[model samples]
Structure formats: C-alpha cells, structure tokens
Target chain A: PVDVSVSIFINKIYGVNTLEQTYKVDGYIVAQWTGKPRKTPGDKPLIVENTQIERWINNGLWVPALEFINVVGSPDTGNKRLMLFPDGRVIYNARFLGSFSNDMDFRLFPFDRQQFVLELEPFSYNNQQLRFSDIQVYTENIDNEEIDEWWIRGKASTHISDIRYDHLSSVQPNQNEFSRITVRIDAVRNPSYYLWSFILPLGLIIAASWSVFWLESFSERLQTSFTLMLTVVAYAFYTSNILPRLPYTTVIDQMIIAGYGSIFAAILLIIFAHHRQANGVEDDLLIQRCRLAFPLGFLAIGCVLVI
Target chain B: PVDVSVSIFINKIYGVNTLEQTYKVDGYIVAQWTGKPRKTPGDKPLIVENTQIERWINNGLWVPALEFINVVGSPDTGNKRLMLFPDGRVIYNARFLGSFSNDMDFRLFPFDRQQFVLELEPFSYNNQQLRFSDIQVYTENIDNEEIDEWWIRGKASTHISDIRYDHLSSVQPNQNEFSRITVRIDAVRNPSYYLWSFILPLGLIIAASWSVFWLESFSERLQTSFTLMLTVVAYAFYTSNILPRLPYTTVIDQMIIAGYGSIFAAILLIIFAHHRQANGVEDDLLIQRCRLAFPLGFLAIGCVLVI
Candidate 1:
C-alpha cells in the first residue's frame, strides 16, 4: 500500500450557492508518495515539470487517480508538476478550480456559519491493501485576514475514514468500503453588507412609518397608511429580487410581514377613529396620541420574533 | 485510433445559478464503439453490470475518460453498465448528476428564457488523429409536460467541434486542441409564482397608496404619505429578500423606485398645498383636490417606464 500524504492551499472563493448547497474553491493540491529510489539529478531532487509528467505516465510510472468525491462536477485543473526525490519519493502538485458540494445551513442568513468541505478518495482503487491513503491540509493555522467575504473561523479539519458502499451490484455486505479523506474549513459570513445596506435602511423606514401617527388629521393618518402599504410591497420587491431564495421565511421576511401589519393596523385604527364619534372625525387623541407607545410595542414584537 | 460515439438522456433540472452562471443536470450517458467480436452465452450480448465492469477495467478492457469541460466540479456517477455484443460492438452506459457552468443571463428574471448547455471533451487526450469522438444525444423525446418548473421550447441540440486550450506547458504551439461536443436545451420559466405571489399584491398596494390624495386635511395628506413611504420600503425588503440577486435592476425593481417617487412626490405636493398660500393658511382647493389626476398621472408614468 502506498502511503500518500496531501496538502491544500486556499487561493480564492467567490461562487457561493444556497439552494444547490455548494461553493467554489480554487487552490493548489500536493500529493507525496514513496517510489523506487533513483539517482538524484545534479545531486538534488529531480523535479519533473508539466511536459515530462505526461511522458513519465507513458513510460511506466504509477499515477494515482485521486477523485474529489464531494465535487459537483469535473474540476478545472491547472498546471501540473511532478517532483521526483532521490529517496524514492514522488510528489505531484497541481492547481485546481472546482465547485464542491457541502451541507450548508443558511437559516440565520446574514449571520450564518458554513463549513466548506472536500472529500478525496481513490475512485478505482477500493482495496485497502492495494492503496490506502492520507490527506494533510497545510493551509490552515495561517492568519491572513484583511478583506474577505467569508471569515475563516477555526483551522481546517481533516479525516481519514473507510467508506463502504453497502448496496452495489447486489454484492455481499463486505465488498465495498474505500479509503476516503475529508477536508473542511469553517467560515462565517461578514455581515457588514446586510447590516448597512439591507437591515439599517429597513429599520429607518419602519420607524418613519410609525411617525405618521403623530400627524394631526384622521384623513392624513388613514391615507399615509395606504402609502406605507405600497412602501412595504416595494421594499419586498427590492429585497426578494436580490436575496437568496429560500423555501421558508427568513428573519428579514418576518420584519417585512411586520411592516405590512403595522401599516394595516394604522389603517384599521384610522377608520375606527373616523367613525368612533369622539371629536367628530377630527381627532381621537387616545388612539392617535399613542404614537409613542407603538414604537416600543413593535420593538417587543420584533424581540419576540427573534426569540 | 478509437471512435467513441456517445448518447445522453436528460432526466431532471432545477437549480440554476445566475451569478456563477451555472445549472444542474442529471442524465444517463451511453457510449458505443465497435470492438472485436467476442463469444457470449448462447450468442447473446453480454451485459456486465457495475462490479463486473470494474473487473473489466482492471483487466485490459479500454475505457475512455469522458469529462465535462464546462462542469463546475466532479460529477457524481450512479449505475454503470457495459454491454458486449458478438458483432464487434461495445456500449458503456452510466448515470451522472452534475452542476455545469455556462453563460447565463437573468436580466429578465421571473419572465426569463434560458438555454441550459453542456460541453463534453476527452480528458488527457489531445490528438484528434489518435482518438476522435462523436456525441449523439438520442433520448426518447416524448411529451413530458405533466410536472416541470420550466417549459421546453425547442428540441435538444448537439454539435461536435474541436476546442483549443490556450494555456499549457511553455513549449506548446501545436499540441492543445481537443475534440468537444456541445449540447443545448432551450427553456422558458413559469412566471405564475412570481406574478401571483409578488406582482399582484404589489399592484394592489400601489393602487391603495394613490388613494391618499382623497384624504381631507393637509396634515392627513402629509402624514399618510410618510406611511406610504414606509410601506414601499417594507415591500422592497420583501421582494429583494426572496428574489434572485442580480447586479442590474429588473422591471420589478424599477416599480419599487417608482413607489418611492410617488410617495416623495405626495410629500412635496402635500407641503406645497399646506404652505405657499395664494390666499391664506387654509387648504388650496386646486392642488389638494388632485385625487383624480394623480392616479392617471401615475398610470402615464408607469406606461412611460414600460416604454
């Protein structure tokens, strides 16, 4: 069995998927294994670059077909270099751009944490005695944080496990397990964009919506409520057009419902004041003057929603 | 030289990414080529299922590495079958699920027309003279309209071409062209969900916002405008939160801006009617009574926006 060691370096990340539960990772991959010892080229490690690597494959060099089990489709591989050491070791290094699939939960959304994972395994070689493996991620434990969309939280974790395909070809129970390596990186979304651009502006608008109760006439109160209704719908369009489409409602969506409810509540109260016969359609000071009370009330409801 | 002819059968598609310009596809791939005639049990074709197929791979049976050039990562393979015939023919069939990358435009969004595409090329094989390829997508194209998120507009299209890769080893001028097959499926999105859930409600709310002009007092007109402003902001939040995020604005977003404009316009007009008196601090009969004109004005403006 060839004991193969591996390392990965993260270079960039941009394509993030919510529904497909996937993300794009561009990095370099290194695989090292001991081979038949040979004389060193110029008394040093013989580094075979791109062109010679293909030639070596034709000559009789064993290149392990390592497959990324978690990858969504075929990875775009970049430059490949084969390093041959004097002590019978072979190191294959290559750059790769791939979209990897992972179980990502975005329930908290703007404040969500995600773990980007990659599973590596030998697709054709399943026998442990034929080819067992190991993967080491050296990219972790390094601190370089200035500007990033996703904040890398802890150091990257890795695992070497035996995965058995129990129900293939109606074979017996003991014929399908393969050696696998799983690499993972934990990350949290940098929520500055949502806080400043989405949430803050929405809060100001909701606050402004309630201030309409402070106006003098009942007609003003009722009519402006209708305008606020339109505003809520307009806001919904702006948000839904740009946000991640989830099957269920989000925190932002709950606030949206509250905005709609607040405007409708104002409308109902205005109509009640007009017909209540207190001051004859002019002012129902008891209900209209409670503009101070509504803000705190919405705050409680908002807090309750979060809870 | 080996001629590899392939056929693909599309099964399902749903996840579509506009930012990454990608889509998901699941299908069965059938590869057929002529081989040396072999004796079978009672002159029948030998069907080697998954496990048997692997045994053949370990032996001397040749299998070409057909990779998706435009796919985002490695595709997940399902069942694999190899059919060996007595008359010098071999067929390799397999099922695959993958997320493929392509040029996607979501400027139209809910009412969008998209063409899902897939490109297949021989991996590690550059010389067309050594190994040529032909992809024939001959799936049973029957009317499958019972359940689908999209409406297929055209028949699936296919083409065979030679794609040239630019970047490789430094000393490479004439050794990079690979045989490639391109497949396309044209489809139109079902806009029923967006229309009923988003646009219809927005229309109702916008219509209600305009009714603010009919309110009695100047304070009523002005204060109600603030509520309408809040409503628009709320609605924009709802829309942007659920809809597909795009760099540019859509028809829905433009209407959102118009809602803000309508409310701001009312705010300006309400203040003008309350102050700048031609005769006193009383209401202006001319401007304040424009409840009839504003609706038609918004209609005209809406039409202009469409134009």
Candidate 2:
C-alpha cells in the first residue's frame, strides 16, 4: 500500500444564503502519497479522472470527502484534478466551488460575521487518519481577505468525529467507519456594494418618505402620500428582487413595511383632519398643525424602529 | 408474474422558485397489480421496505422504477405501501412531495400562462410497458383555485410514446427498449395577489415618490428628494425579500429602477432649477412651475406608464 500525504488549501468563502442557509466556498485540495520506487513508463505525471476517483470512493480506499458543515444545501463541485507523480508521490489537487449547508441568520446581512467551515474525513478508511499535524491553510499572506466571499484568516479552530450517509450501504461494519476533521475560519462582511447600492439609497428613501406632510394643500398632501406609498412598494419590489429569500423578516423588510404604514397613516390623518367638520366649521388649525405634527409623530414612531 | 397497474392523483402545484428554476408539486401515486390466483395466505399482503426496493431495482426483477424527467433534483418519495390481492391483482400506493425543474420565465409573472409537466418512464424496464394510464388533477375542483399560487382550472393533457435513450446500457439494442409517457397540465396565475399586494401598492409608492417637488424651501425640496430616494431603496429591499430572484430583470424591477432614476434625476433638476441663476437672478419660474407642473407632468408621465 502507498503512503499518501494530503493537504487542503482553503481560499475565498462568503455570501451567506439566509433562506437556504448556506455558504459558498472556493478552494483547492492537495494530496500526496509516495508509491514504491519504480521505473517510469514516461516522465509525465499520470492524470486520473473523476470516474476513477469515485471508484476509489466506492471501494475501501480512503479519500477525504469534505463536507461544508454550516452550508444549507449541497456544495457545488467545480474543476477537479488528480496528479500522479513519477517519483511515487501521488498528489491530488482540485479546485472546488460549492455552496455548503449551514444554519445562518442574515438579519444583519452586510454587517454580519460568518464562519466558513469544512468537515474533512476518510470516505471508507479509519486507519489512514488525516495528518492534521501537517495541514496548513494558504490564505494567511493574502491582504483584504474580507473583500472576498471566503477569508481563510486562521487554521482549523474546531475538529470532531462523525458519520454521514445517503443510502445505507450493505458493506461491513468498519468499512464505512470514518473520522471527521473540522476546519473553521472567521469572516466579516464586505459592506461596500450594499453601502453604495442599498444602504445609502435606503437612508435617502426613508428621509424622503417623511416629506409627504410638507405639501401646502390638503389635496397636495394626501395625494402626494399615495405617491410615497407607491414609491415604498416599488422599492420593496426592487429590494425583493435582489436580496435572498427568508422565512422570517429582516431589519430592512420591517423598515419598509413601516414606511408603507406611516405614509398610509398620514394619508388617513390628512384627510380626516380636513374633512372632519366640527359644528359645520373646517378644522383648519388641525390640518395646518398636522403638517408639522405628523412628521414629528412619525419621527417618534421611527425612533422605536431603531430600538 | 403479478401484474400491477398504476394511477397518479395530483393534489396541488405551487411555489415556483425562480432562482433555482424549480416548482413544488404534491401528489399521490396508486399502483395496482395482480398476483397469482391462489388460496388465502392470512389474507395480508407481504410488506416490503425501502431497502428491499433498491435491491429490486439493482437486480433484474420486474419492479417498475418511475423517473420524473423534468425534475431538477431527485423527487422526495414519501409514504409508500404494498397491498396484496387474493384475486390476482396487487396494489402499491404512495405519496410524493417534490420540487421539479423546468425552464420558466416570470417576467409577466402575475398574468402569465404556465404549464406544470411530469414525465414518467420505467427506470430499468425493457419490453414491459405501462398498460392503461389516467391522471386526475384535483386542482379544477377547488373553488378558489384562482386565489392560489397557480390555478389548474382545466383537465390534464396526456401523451405516451416509445422513447429511445441515446445513452444505452451495455445490453444489446433490442433489449434496451423502453416506453415513455408525458403528462402536462396548463395553468394561469391568480393575478389578484400581484394586483393588490404588488401592483396597487407599487402604483401608490411611485406616485408618492414623485411628490418631492412640492416642498417650499430649496433645502426642503432637494433634501426631501434624497429621503424619497432612500425610501425607494428601502421598499426595494422589502420587495426583494418576498419576490423571486431572477437573472434578468422583471417588469416590476424595471419600474422600481425607473423610480430610483426618476427620483435621482428630480434631485439634479430640483437643484439645477433652483441654482441656475440668470444675470444674478435665480431661475425661480421653472422651479415654481415644477411644483404644480410636475404634479400635472407626473400625471402625464403616469399616463405614459400604462402606454
């Protein structure tokens, strides 16, 4: 049997999917195993295909099957390669692009802290244990690591032993025995895109949503509030199109619904303050004060939103 | 060999996921087959488990394996059963919950015509074919079918054929033959939800978005417009959370972007109309006219929105 040495190099990881509750990871894996010294048929390294790799996975041979512990769905497997050395050192190097399953709450999305992790283990072997002593992540030297989807700023922070299966195989008891090693990296969100595209714009919209009460005429004030209502709806659609779907509401979503309710409430008050006749007299003072009062009242309600 | 006949009863189909390009389908399958005519053996049918089903699939036995050709991923098979008959005919019944895949464009989502389809074929059957086929889609019987995600107010259209799998088994050409059946059900969107929840609210918001020009002070006008801009952004976020994600923009998305651009443009014009001095005199006429003119101008622009 050949002695195989393996090393996993994690790259970029980010974009926590709140609805699906998953994180995307892009990285490379390096595996090296020394074979018996033999006369080379050719000077070139032998290339093995994915079919052969699966064949190995199906057999009792040990191959690291890394599962993204926190990812929501199955990770996407991108480009892969198997490199066989002429000097008996078999190195398996492959680039993986996948969205791994996890439990994530993106209520703070652009301002949230997320952890990217990989659970590595032998598919069928317990004897050929992973040499964690030699495992090294290659992202330490990189600058602005947070800008990327995944930032491997540190080494494996956690490890454990576990078993997972799809369809239970009828193999022997120890045949499916495997040890799981967990590698974790902490990451902060890159808020640049959202700041420019969503946050700043949203601040401007909220401020503008408050301006409906400033119009002079009752017709102008009430009519304009409808437009504000429509604007909120339009923005809601726009945001919904871009953001990930989730079961529970987010801070942004709640803020939008509040904007809608506030404007709609203003419309009701503006109309009521004008039409509500007291002994056949127009409520002029109430209408005029409402222009200032509603804005301040809304500000008071809006303050509760921050809390 | 026991002869089994299968019948599928479809319950409801809804929740079309735009990002994944998949839809949820809930239904039940009733399989009826015949066994050898014999004396009663305890009058109970032999129960088969999930593990035994795979064994039957791998071995070259007569157990039928159904495949959903349009399924994006594997279908979630739920609640299965086997019923034996003393008088030759045997029955197998089960429920299925699955998310099937197809190429769907939801640009005109609320008022679009969609077709829910299912393709069934024997997984490993050779010459044996499904005898008689019938599909009972119960969606039509529901009173408020139009209020649901998709309305199936019509009967299921069916077609059967002898399909050839270009990628064949190692077996000889003649033995590789199999039969295929295509089931299709046409559906129309409810439109009510979009009208009330999406369109009506959007119109009100857009109209409110245009009211920024009515403010008296220049600071009020310009600053208010910025707030309106942010309001639109907030609304967009709200909408994005609920709406489906799409690669290309939808009609609603376009309108929301237009709202953003319009507000941004208004800001520039509001500032420009105020600051553009003519011979040391501030250009007040256009700004004053825009106050009322935009209201009318917006009315005119609003007319164009429909056209």
Candidate 3:
C-alpha cells in the first residue's frame, strides 16, 4: 500500500451554524509520500508552484487527490506547491478554507460544547491501494479565554483509520474499505454574555411575576395576572428573536414555557379560590395566601430542568 | 543623539478592563542602533540570549532601557536577545506582556468605539541624549471578525513624537524633551450580543407595559399598574447587576426609568379617571381608551431620548 503522511495547520475555525450543522475551517494541508528518485539540480529539492503543479501531474507525477468527505462543497483552494526531493520524496502543500458538516447538539445553547470534525479520504483509492500512515494537527493557543466568544479546550485531535462500505461492490475482497483521517477540535461557547444579558434578566422577570400573590384585594390579584401573561408572552418573543432557531427547546426556551405554565396555573387557582367557596364569590384565605408557595415550587421545577 | 529604530510585532491583544481603562498586550519589541565595530568569530554576527544580555551590558554594551509611559506596572519580559553584528549594528529583541493605561470612554458601552494605545519613551534619557527615529508595527489580521468579540478596524497606527516636560530642570538645551513612540489600534465592540439579547428584550418590556390601558375596569387598570411597576423595577435591578458600574446611567438605564415614568403616569391617569367624575365614580370613556395615545406619547418621548 502507498502510505501518505498528512499534516494540517489550522489558522481559524468560525461561522458555526446551528440550523445547518456546519462550521468553517481555514488551514494549510500538507501531504507527503515517497516515490522513485529523479535527477535534480545539485541533488536539491525542486519546487513547483500553482500552475506548474498541473503540468507536473500531466508529466506522470503520482499526486493522489484527497477529498474532504464532510465538506459541504468543494474547498476554496489557495496557494499550492509541490516539493520534489531527489531522495524520492514528494510533498504536496496547499491552503484550504471549507465548510464541513457534523452532528451538533445545541440543547444547552449558550453553554454548549462543540466538536468540529474533518474527514479526509482518497477519492478513488481503497485501503488496499492507498493508506494513511500518520497525521499531525497544529492549532492556535492564543489564550484570550476570558474575552473570546469561543474557548478551545485542547489541541486538535487526530485519528487515522480504515472505513469499510458494506453496500460497495462485492467483486473485490478488500476494495470496499478506504483509508480515512478524522480530525476533531473540542470547543465550548463562552456563556458570559448569555449569563448576564439573557438568562439573568429572564430570571428577574420570572421572579417578579410571583409578586402577584402579594396583592391584598382578590380583584387586584386576579386582574394583575393578565398583565403578567402579556409580559411573559413579550419575553418569549424576545427570547425567540435572539436565540438560534432549533428543532427542540433549549434550557432558556423551557424556562420561558415554565413562565407561561406558572402564570396559567395561577389564573386557574385564582378563579378556583373564588368559585370553590362555601357561599357566593367569597375567596378562600388559605389558597389566596399562596404568595410564597409558587416561587418555591417554581424554583424546585427549575432545579429539575437543570438535571 | 543615538537614533534607535523601533519595530513592534503584536502577537495578541486582550483583557480589556472597562472600569480601570486598561488593556493587555502581548508582543515582541525590536530596537536597532549602530554601535562601534567589534570583532566576531568567523566575522559573522554573534547572538546573545536571556542571561548573557545583562553580562554584555556589564561589558560596556550601550543597551538603552525603553519604558512604557502608560503601562500600569512593569511589563512581564520573556526571552530576550542581542544580535551583535561585525559591522557595528546592534539589535535588541524581547517578548513582553503588559497592562497599559489609556483614556477610554465607554458611554456607548456595547456599541462603543475604542483605541488601544501603547506609549514608549526613554526612562532616563532626553531627546538630546536619545531620540526615536522611526517605528514599524506588525499586527495579526486573522479575519475572524464575525466570531471575535472585538473587530479591529485597521492595522496598528504608529507615531514618533517629542514630549517636552515643562517641570523638568532647564539646566541644558533640549534636555526636557523626551522622544516618544505612540502606537494606536482602533477597535469597535461587537454589539451582536447586546442588540438581540439585552436591548431587544428591554424594548419589548416597555412596549408590553402600554397594554395596561386596554383594561375595561378602573380597579383592573389601577391595580395592574403596580405589577407593571414591579416588572420595570425587576428589570432595572437586572440591568444594574450585569452592566459595568459607571458614574452615570446608560441608555438601558434611561429606558428603565422611562418605563417607570410611563407606568407612574398611567397610575395617575387611572386614579384620575375614577375620581374626576361629573356625578359619582363614573369613568370617562374618552380618557379610558387612551391605549393608543400612551403608546404614541411614549414613542415621542423615546425619540426625545435618542436625541
């Protein structure tokens, strides 16, 4: 098997999309392999850049085409070069920027952790013909964790393995398997902005709504619930407008629903307290003084949501 | 005068403190000057690193100490080296991380524009003894503007000027004038987080409060005002808890006060509608349906706040 050593130097990772499950990566990719030794000026390595690389390929150079399996579309290729050493080594280096797809879970949203992945495999070659020997990855470690929006957890992780396609042609024994390289970079969203700006204000709104129980008059308590309902609805719209649209509810979304549920429950109880009486529309004092009960109950429910 | 050429390679800029008006910068400083010709092994340039730098200073090497005039404290110096060329050219290169002080205005807060400054001057020497000839700056342009918190406007701007201290002794001509090299990097805060999360939600709260005037009963309108008052208070508290402590109120703070004023004015109108009756406690139909009027009035007041 022809063994190819791969190295990737990641310049940046950005534009993470929740709805599309895509992320952008800009980096330099280097592939090295050994071939037949050829004559060179003073036995030194010969360099071929950009357009000359295609000419050398036409002149019977064995430059294998590696495809990014997970890339949404073809990568934007920048400057490319070939270093052909007289010692039978051929190195291909190119700069690439691509958007790759992956399975992302944003259930926690602003406090979510993500792993950006890159899959590389030879387009036409099977594992029996072309194999990935090793891979090296280099990522930036400019530690500005406190200020940056996303904090990288560790160095870029890499693994080289063989992928077997079960539905491939069964004519050849090992032709179904292909050599693949997977790169993973772990990162966590900086939750500072959400904590202070989104979640904290949301908490205050929910807590303040509980004050409906404090009103002395039953008419005052019952009428105030409608205003609270409108406020919660306004908050729900505000939360949805800012946050990334997802198929399922996030922690903040669930909290907003809980806000709605709490107000609706209070409405039911407020009417029940007045109607389910011994005589007339006289209120039940015990049910009316549930001022402290709802806040504590909601706090418990919030803890459950956390788990 | 010893004309020293300065070159700064900025690696990273982070840790901006809003309250203290300080920022951290990590970079390499290069100073080049011509000295008396010296003998070197094989007639090549000699390199001295780290500890050997101080030893060369003891051996009569003229290494001028450049101080950061606006730095909060002494900079954390990393690896340092001296390149002694056979042609008498001396070069000093060192890595440094420093917290620098600057006059920063954060009145606009998340939407604010700021300039990070670095002032370099001779600690002991005047313009007559030592002068700054020219300066070159190298700043990173990784172009992750969409994700990064601070979007740098352009390349680092630099200037070399003379600062004359009037308090200094007039014992010699031009003795009080110190050569200063000032580097300025203009940056604008990314308002993406604040716009969608903080400001949008606040606008909704204020808008939703205007719905209190839609109530049919006088008791409903009067009592609902108290809940609206509480909601605005809760929002004000939330604003204070998260926002940077400042001597004056911010736009959001002013908005919160406007919410309070609107609710209070509604409370006065609600009570006035009941008491200002022709016979008994009959509400005025025209004044009660001021639902559209209050929103329009508040909108006008909001425009006034903008100006």
Candidate 4:
C-alpha cells in the first residue's frame, strides 16, 4: 500500500444551480507519492511542465489516477506538471475547472447558507493498496468581499477517511474499501440584491392586500378582492420567472401563498358578515372592524411562519 | 512648468448605483515627473513606502496633488509610495477606492450600454505651470467575463488634452486653460438575469391581458378588465421597486403604460359595444369580435413605440 498526499488550491466558486444541485469550481490539485529513488540532473529535483509530464508517465511512471466522486462530467484540465526528486518523491499537479454535484438547500433563498463539497477517491486502487496520507485545501480571497455574489464564511473544512462499500467484485479481498478525501466550504448568499429587489416589494404587496377592509361598500370590498387575487397571481408569476427553481417552497414562496390565503379569507368574511345578522340584512360592526384585527393576526402568523 | 506622466491600473469596477448615477472604482494610480537632480546614497534610487512618503513631503518634496474631476468626494486612499531616482525623476504611487458620478442613461434598462470615465487634472496648477504628457489605463480582467455583472467590450480609450474655462479669473494670463487626462471604458450590462426574470414574465402578463377579448358576456369582459388593471398595477409597483430609479420612463415602463391603456381601452370598447346599438340596445357583433383586432392593433402600436 502507498500513501499519497493531496493539496487543493481553490481559485473560485460560482454559478450555484439550485435546480440541478450543482456548482462550478476552478482550482489546482496536487498529488505526491514516493517510489524507488532515481538519478536526477545535477543531483537535484527534476522539473517537468505541461506535455513533458505525459512523457514521464509514458516512461513507466506509476501515477495513480484520482477521480471526483460527485463531479457531473470530466473536468476541463488546464495545465499539468510533474516534479521528480532524486530522493524518490514524485509530485503531480494539474489545474481543473468543473461542475460538482451536492445536496443544496435553498428554503431560505436570498438569506440562505450553503456548503460546497468535493469528494476525491482513487479510480482503481482500494484502501489496502493505496491510501491518502494528508489533504489540505487553500482558498485565496483577497479582493473586496462585497463585490462577490457569495461570501465565504471561513477556511475550507477537510477530512481523509476510508469509504467501505458492500457491493463490489465478488470474492475480491479488501477491494470494496477505498481512501476518500472530502472538502467542504461554507458560504452565504449576499442578501442585499434580493432585499432591495424581491423581498421589500413583496412585503409591500402583502401589506397592501390588507387595505381591502378599508372599503366602505360591500360590493366595493368584494369586487376589489378579485383584483387582489389577480394581483397575487401576477406577482407569483414574476417570482417564479426570476428566482431559481427549487423542489420545495422558499420563504418568499410561503409568503406569497399567505397573500393568496389572506385575500381569499377576506372574500369569504366580507360575504358572510353582510348576510349573517339577527336583526336585518345589514352589516356586522365587529367583522367590518377587522381592519386592525386582520393586520395584527397576519403579522402574528408571519412570525410563526419564520419560527 | 512640469510634464507629468500618469498610469492607472484598474483593479475592479462594481457597485453600479443607477439612482445615484454613480459607480465604485478600485485601482492604483502612478504619477512620474522630473525635477532638479539630487544626490542619492550609494548612487542608487531612494525608495519610500507608505508613511515614509509623507515624511519626504514634510521634508520639502515637490509632489503635486492630482484631482479627480468626476469623483463624488475624497477617495479612500490606501498604500502610498515614492521612488526618488538620482536622475531627478520622481514617481508617486498610491491605491484608491472611490465612487464617481456620470450622466448615466438607463432608458433601455437591462439592455443598456455605459461608459466608466475618469478625468484627471492638477489641483492648483493651470496649463501654464503643469501639463500632462501621457496617460495610460490598464485593466486586468483575466477571470471569466461571464462571471462578472458587466462585461467590458474592449481596451480602455484614453485622451490627454487641454480643458478651458470661460468663466475663470478674467485678468490672469492663460489661466483659463488646464491640462486634463480623460479615460473611458465601454461596457455592456449582462442582461441574462433581467431577461429571464423581468422581461419574460412581463411579456406573459401583457399577452395574457389581451385574452380579455376572449370573454363572451359583457359583464365578464368588463369585470375581468378591472382584475387585469390591478395585475398591471401590482407589476408596475414591483418593477419600480426593483429597477434602478430613472427620471425618464424605461422600455419596461412604457410597456407597463401600454398594459394600462390596453385594459382601459378594452373597458371603453366593452361598454360601448353593448350600448351603441340602434336595434333594442343589443351588442355590436363586429366590435365584440375584436378578439384578433385588439391583439394585432396593440402589436402595431408597440412596434411604433419601439421605433
């Protein structure tokens, strides 16, 4: 069994796709291992870059192929290099840009927190033959943070462990267990754009829907509800067209549903309050004065939704 | 009199504020000029960094202050340095982050084009005392252009000329003219977000509003117009809240007005078709069949508005 050291320098993380549960990563990966010692020019470390690294591999170099467990497809490899030392150590480095898949939750939407993960494993070798000795992840983020769409919270978290699989080649000894490297980067979506653009306007629409109770006439109150219903529909379409598609409803989506429910409930109450009377077919003062009550009630329900 | 050579390295351009007609720029500025030759220690150039540059100024260094003509206020100056050569050449370098104002036209909104400009001139010296010999602007945009909100079209355009003021001190000789360095960078907005989010759904709402003519009964037609009107109102509020506030109406704003007009005209037509009848106040069949006519007529009007 051989122990290989891995180091990854993350250049950038962007293009988070909520629908596909994917994100783009651009970075460099380095893997180092030791084998039989060899003579080098001037008794120093030999350097090889780009296409020359392939020639060294062709000349009987044992370079273990690493695979990304969660990558969508083969990555676009940019540059490659090999460093061979006279003492027996060999290093293989390459730059890659790829889309990686993970389980992402966006229920909070513009105010959501997410983790970008990367899983690395050997393509053929198992834990018994080849294993990871160490793994390090480095991120370079020196520019102004406000300029970026997502803000990284802290340094990347890393783990190197054995992954045991139950189903594999039948009767193969220790072939199912492989060495795996996992890296996680925590980040938060910049809420400024959504706050000024989506959330504030939506709040205004919901708050305005409560004004239906202000109408003096019963016909006026009931007819305006239909318009309010159509307004909510148009707003819903606007939300769906812009926001990223998600399997579950977000905080904004939930508020939109509440908007529809509140309008519909007002419609039912307006009609009921006018008819249900013991004296004559007149209006009910208590139900009509729900102007203050409905707003407060909706506010309470909104707090509960957030909780 | 001195001829100053200036160079600017634009690091970033972001935080474009449409309402304020301002944009933030982060970059390094370098100014070089020749003075009386001075002896240096060991005949080598003396380098002063950060705080020491100020010490040199305290020691009677003739460093001219350059002013940004379009800057909103004083910029946040970062690091400062000075290179004093034995050949009487003085180079002053500093980093700055500042907001600049410009006459931005957002009449086309998401599909608009803009220019980021910078104007430099001596703070006190007129053209007779100090003149700009050359000005160079360099932008480092090696990252993927798709990742940025604004895509720069080409290299920066530069000019060094004299700016004359007619209302300056009338008695002074040649005091009206001052040397100026102007740099312009042309860019186009990345319309992807606004296209799928705002424009597409808005188009759907407008097209859906045209379906009012498809209604059969007179009351159905008239009542639905009110709902359509409210939908347009909600959309207008949403648009106004999210879009950059401009003094003039944008293309989307015009579309919103067209929506309102279409609904209002349909209201008038629906009422007129029912009443303007000679035979027992029956509906006009020709006007009622305006289902195709209204959509086509609106389309022609929209084309005219665009032109």
Per-model TM-score on C-alpha atoms: 0.59, 0.50, 0.57, 0.55
Candidate 4 lDDT by residue in tens digits, A99-217: 78776667788878889988887654564243343334454453444677777777777787777755323425546688888888888887888879888998898888889899998
Best candidate per DockQ, number? 1
Q: All models, DockQ values?
A: 0.20, 0.07, 0.05, 0.05
Which of the two, 1 or 2, has more DockQ? 1
State the displacement of the C-alpha of residue A209, model 2, in Å, after optimal TM-score superposition: 16
> What are the per-residue Cα lDDT tens digits for candidate 1 across B100-120?
987766767767888888888
In candidate 4, what are the lDDT values of residues B163-242, reduced to their tens digit?
A: 87777567686576778888887887767546645565565557666666655467777887878788888888777766
For model 2 the TM-score comes to 0.50
Best-to-worst order by lDDT is 4, 3, 1, 2
Error in Å for residue A232 of model 2 = 16
The CA lDDT of each predicted structure is 0.71, 0.60, 0.74, 0.74
Which sections of candidate 1 miss by over 4 Å? Answer: A18-20, A36-44, A128-146, A167-174, A237-248, A278-285, B1-14, B17-23, B26-307
Give the winner by TM-score: 3 or 4.
Answer: 3
Tens-digit lDDT track for model 3 on A221-244?
788888778777777776676567
Q: For model 3, which pairs clash?
A: none
Highest lDDT model number: 4
Which residues of candidate 4, in runs, are more than 4 Å off? A1-307, B127-147, B168-171
Give candidate 2 misplaced runs (Cα > 4 Å). Answer: A1-307, B1-5, B15-18, B33-61, B69-88, B140-147, B168-171, B174-177, B244-248, B284-288, B291-307
